[PDB]
Every structure is written in C-alpha cells, then in structure tokens.
C-alpha cells in the first residue's frame, strides 16, 4: 500500500508543520507525480510515512512525537531561495 504525506510549513503562517494532503494507493502515486512536476522534495522514510499517515489527518498540524523528525525533513527540503 503506497502512501504519501504532503507537509507544508511557512514561518509566520503555519504555527506548526501542517499535513495539507495525504494519499494512499492511486492518490499517493498522483501526489508523487505532482511533486515531480512542481519540484517538491520527496523523501522515502517508511516508518515515518506510516506513522504520519495513521496519526496526522489531512488539515491537522503535526503533534509532539513528530516535531523533530519533521524538522529534519524541513531542514533538508527547504528552498533557501538563492
């Protein structure tokens, strides 16, 4: 079962990283295709993906167990814009 979790964090707007979209199966495949189209970093991390999928529903902010693992993702994925 394929899963994809789309995280959004923008300083000043989102008080915490936000799960803005999720998908399983066909929808997960589509999210990944769109990620490629828009050059959004995609990271494979099976334990984290499964746990996020189960715990943090679409439109929910991440919770404490995820703060650091998601921070690490943001640090590698952030576009520094130069």
């Amino acid at each position: 079962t394929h899963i994809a979790i789309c995280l959004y964090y923008k300083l000043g707007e989102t008080p915490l990283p936000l799960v803005i979209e999720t998908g399983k199966d066909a929808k997960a495949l589509q999210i990944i295709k769109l990620a490629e189209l828009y050059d959004i970093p995609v990271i494979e991390d099976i334990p984290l993906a499964r746990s996020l999928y189960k715990n943090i529903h679409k439109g929910q902010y991440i919770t404490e167990d995820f703060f650091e693992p998601v921070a690490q993702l943001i640090r590698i994925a952030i576009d520094l814009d130069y």
Binding site: I20, I40, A49, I74, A77
Partner: peptide, 17 residues
C-alpha cells in the same frame, strides 16, 4: 477542481513509504 495540485505546488516536502 485543482485544489490537490495547488496544495502540492506550495508544499514543503513529501514523505512516502
């Protein structure tokens, strides 16, 4: 239509299994 694509376009990172 288009909400999915607009969300992905603005997103920060995707985690997958």
């Amino acid at each position: 239509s288009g909400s999915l694509a607009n969300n992905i376009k603005k997103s920060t990172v995707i985690v997958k299994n």
